[PDB]
Design a protein around this ligand. Structure first.
Ligand SMILES: [Cl-]
Ligand SMILES: [Cl-]
Length: 257
């Protein structure tokens, strides 16, 4: 049962480190693509399976290297992951959405044959930090064929996204760049009631929490991607009846349970 199932039965502990798949890396140079600023693809190797794909945007003034740890972590749990560089480091959230859109088309159509051989382009998802997270909400609303969206410490001036794509938002309690009361929590609140949605808030963490290995971001991002990109109900346990000391808030409409 479940053609998309990959990897062993999960434990929390296994989800805080790199997973069972070996990972290859391919550098997409800036000038080799129109529509975004290149980036790095992390993708499984040593395997004959196909996997869902994820496009992920860094944050304001940031490089793709800021999220390398998470691109590798995801790919090692069984995902083809393209972390973009933006055309300009100063690009805003809606610009980042359009570049996510270009990056997804690139992954499907024009990436190297070794990458395409590992990708099931029918199952794609998006994630992003800061302003990249605002771009994630924008594209989830523009393109409801996506399987999931994970905005990390997100920032946007627009507060309402009418999307049927399942969304998990990571807020940081002590974020002063995108305070959760103005950004993350309103985005959560304003998503449709019928859309499966989760908000998790990291205790004593600031806007830079996504820039380095973080156990909570690892568990919740892996689990949400697994549950919706792979229909993998083994990951429901990490997302249901949550009692996590690392979190200082938790909200959900509990549609995913
Ligand atoms: Cl913009
Ligand atoms: Cl092959």
């Amino acid at each position: 049962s479940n053609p998309y199932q990959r990897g062993p039965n999960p434990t929390r502990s296994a989800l805080t480190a790199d997973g069972p798949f070996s990972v290859a890396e391919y550098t997409v140079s800036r000038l080799s693509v129109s529509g975004f600023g290149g980036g790095v693809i992390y993708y499984p190797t040593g395997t004959s399976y196909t996997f869902g794909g994820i496009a992920m945007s860094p944050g304001y003034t940031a490089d793709a290297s800021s999220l390398a740890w998470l691109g590798r972590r995801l790919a090692s749990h069984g995902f083809v992951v393209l972390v973009i560089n933006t055309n300009s480091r100063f690009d805003g959230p809606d610009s980042r959405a359009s570049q996510l859109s270009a990056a997804l088309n690139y992954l499907r159509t024009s990436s190297p044959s070794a990458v395409r051989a590992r990708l099931d382009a029918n199952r794609l998802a998006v994630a992003g930090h800061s302003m990249g997270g605002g771009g994630t909400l924008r594209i989830a609303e523009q393109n409801p064929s996506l399987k999931a969206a994970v905005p990390l410490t997100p920032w946007h001036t627009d507060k309402t996204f009418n999307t049927s794509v399942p969304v998990l938002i990571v807020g940081a309690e002590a974020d002063t760049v995108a305070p959760v009361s103005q950004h993350a929590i309103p985005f959560y609140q304003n998503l449709p009631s019928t859309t499966p949605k989760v908000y998790v808030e990291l205790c004593n963490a600031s806007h830079i929490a996504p820039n380095s290995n973080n156990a909570a971001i690892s568990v919740y991002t892996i689990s949400w991607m697994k549950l919706w990109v792979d229909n993998d109900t083994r990951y429901r346990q990490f997302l249901c009846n949550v009692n996590d000391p690392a979190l200082c808030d938790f909200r959900t409409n509990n549609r995913h349970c």
